[PDB]
C-alpha cells in the first residue's frame, strides 16, 4: 500500500464574539456564518482572507426576525442559499431566504412553508449540500422527536425542496428503527456525500448526564424513503466527536475524555494523528467543538476554537492509493 498524510496548523483571529460558528467551503475559500449576541443580534457572513476573518455582510439586518433563528445553509457548486427560520409555535413556519452566486452579494425575500411537516419536531442550525434522489436534487430540513414513551414508528423526519428552497412540499421518510424510548436527541444534522445520506446527532444519557454522539448510515430503498442503521465508531477511553469521509473511507475525530484536552483523528480506523492544543503556548485550551469542513476527496479542515477569538485550523491531506 501507499499512504500519504499531510497536516498543517494555521490560526485565524475573529474580531466578532461568535456564539455559534458554522463553516463552509465555497470556491476553495473558507467562510463562516457567525452568530453574534446590551447589544444587538447579528448573523455575519465572514471569509478567511489571510489569518483573519472578514465580515462580508449581516443577514439578520435584512430580516424582521426576532431572537435566534435556525440557520440552514446549502452550498451548491456555484450558488449559496441560506435560510433563517424563526424559533418557537404557529401552524406554518416563516423563514427568510438569501441567495448568492459569489461570496459577496446576497439577495433576500421572506418565504412561508404552510402547514409544514416538522410541527413539534426539534430543529438545529447546519450547513449542507444538495442530495440527488433519482435524478433530482433536494435541500433537506430535518427534525427529530425530542423524547419518546410509546414505540410504533416517524422519529426522524425531513421536509425537502427541489426548487432551490423556494417551496418545501417534499417529504423524505426516515425509518430509524433503533430509536430509543426514554432518551432525548439533541443536534441532528444530515451528513451528505455522493447521493448517500447519513445523520450525526447526540443522545442524552440517563445513567450519567453527558451527551453522546451517534452516527447512522441510510440506504435508499423506495423513492423518498430511506432506511437507516447505527454505525459503530466506539473506541475505548476515547469519546466519539465528529465524522466525515475522505477517499470513500471514514475520517473520525475523538476526544481523550469529555474535557477534550486532546483530539485524535482516525483515517479508515487504520492511521491516526494526535492534536494537542498546546501549540501557541496556550495552556488552558482544548478541542471542544472540533469539526470537519470537507473540501475535496483528499482534503479537509479540522477546526475548533481553543480560546475566545482564536481559531485553530488543521489542514489535512490524506491519500490511500
Amino acid at each position, epitope marked *: 500500500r501507499h499512504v500519504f498524510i499531510r497536516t498543517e496548523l494555521s490560526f485565524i483571529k475573529n474580531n466578532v464574539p461568535c456564539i455559534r460558528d458554522m463553516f463552509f467551503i465555497y470556491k476553495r475559500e473558507l467562510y463562516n456564518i457567525c452568530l453574534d449576541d446590551e447589544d444587538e443580534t447579528h448573523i455575519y457572513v465572514q471569509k478567511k482572507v489571510k489569518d483573519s476573518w472578514i465580515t462580508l455582510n449581516d443577514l439578520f439586518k435584512e430580516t424582521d426576525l426576532t431572537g435566534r433563528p435556525h440557520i440552514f445553509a446549502y452550498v451548491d457548486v456555484e450558488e449559496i442559499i441560506i435560510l433563517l427560520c424563526e424559533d418557537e409555535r404557529k401552524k406554518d413556519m416563516t423563514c427568510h431566504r438569501f441567495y*448568492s452566486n459569489d461570496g459577496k452579494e446576497y*439577495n433576500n*425575500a421572506e418565504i412561508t412553508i404552510s402547514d409544514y411537516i416538522l410541527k413539534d419536531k426539534l430543529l438545529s442550525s447546519y450547513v449542507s449540500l444538495p442530495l440527488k434522489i433519482e435524478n433530482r436534487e433536494y435541500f433537506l430540513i430535518c427534525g427529530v422527536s425530542p423524547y419518546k414513551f410509546k414505540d410504533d414508528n416517524d422519529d426522524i423526519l425531513c421536509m425537502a425542496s427541489h*426548487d432551490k428552497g*423556494e*417551496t418545501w412540499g417534499t417529504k423524505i421518510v426516515i425509518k430509524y428503527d433503533n430509536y430509543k424510548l426514554g432518551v432525548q436527541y439533541f443536534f441532528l444534522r444530515p451528513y451528505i456525500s455522493k447521493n448517500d445520506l447519513s445523520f450525526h446527532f447526540y443522545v442524552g444519557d440517563n445513567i450519567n448526564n453527558v451527551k453522546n454522539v451517534n452516527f447512522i448510515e441510510c440506504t435508499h430503498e423506495k423513492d423518498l424513503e430511506f432506511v437507516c442503521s447505527n454505525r459503530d465508531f466506539l473506541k475505548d477511553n476515547k469519546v466519539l466527536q465528529d465524522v466525515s469521509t475522505l477517499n470513500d473511507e471514514y475520517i473520525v475525530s475523538y476526544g481523550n475524555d469529555n474535557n477534550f484536552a486532546e483530539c485524535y483523528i482516525f483515517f479508515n480506523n487504520e492511521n491516526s494523528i494526535l492534536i494537542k492544543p498546546e501549540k501557541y503556548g496556550n495552556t488552558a485550551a482544548g478541542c471542544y467543538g472540533g469539526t470537519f469542513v470537507k473540501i475535496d476527496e483528499n482534503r479537509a479542515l479540522f477546526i475548533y476554537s481553543s480560546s475566545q477569538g482564536i481559531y485553530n485550523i488543521h489542514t489535512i491531506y490524506y491519500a490511500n492509493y
Partner: antibody
Amino acid sequence: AVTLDESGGGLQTPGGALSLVCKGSGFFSFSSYTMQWVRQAPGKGLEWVASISSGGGTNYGAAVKGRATISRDNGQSTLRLQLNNLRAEDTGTYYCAKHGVNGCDWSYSVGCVDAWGHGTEVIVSS
Amino acid sequence: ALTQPSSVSANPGETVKITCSGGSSSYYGWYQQKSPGSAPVTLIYNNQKRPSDIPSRFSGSKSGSTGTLTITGVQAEDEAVYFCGSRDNSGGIFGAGTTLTVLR
C-alpha cells in the same frame, strides 16, 4: 431545444375571463423548469405577469394579483394562465417563457429566461 | 427599477455597450425585439449565458447593481430594441428598452 405554443387569445369582453394555454414540446423533465407568463401592451415594454417554480411556487405581478392563476400540468408539458375581471390594461400580447435548466435566484426573476413562445394577442374590448 | 438608455447608436464594426442599472438580483438577461409585433429573443441570460444560434459577438456582464450587454462588431441586422430583465422585491422587472440605431 424546447417549443412553446400559446393559444387562448383574441377579443375578450371587459369584466370577462381569459384562459391561455401553452403546449410545450421537446422538454426533458418539464417538471423541473420555472415557467412564466410575460405580457406586452401595444407600443409598451415587456411586463412580468406570473411565475410557477418547479415545486409549484406561484408569484404574480402587482397588476394581476388576485385576478390571475398560473398552473402547470407536468404530464402534458402544459402551462396555463387564467385571468378574470379583464380590463383595458390587460390588452396586449402574452408570451409563454421558460428559465434555463439551472434556474436562478428567484422563480419570479426575469433575467434567466432562455426560451419564449410565439405569443398570443389579447384584446379586452367591447 | 431597471433603468436603461432609450437609444444607442453605432457604426457597423464598432463595439457597442448597453447598460442596465437597478434591481436586487444575482442575474440579468438581455432580450432582443426586432419589431413591436415580434416575440422577444433571449440573447444573454443568467448574466453571461448565451443560447444556441446567438452570435459570439453578443457578450454579457454584471458589475454590482449593473448589467452590460456588449455587441463586438455591430452589423446592420443588429438594429432592434434591447430589453434587460432582472429581479426586485416586487417580482420580475424589465427595462424600458434600448433602441440600437445603426449609423450610415
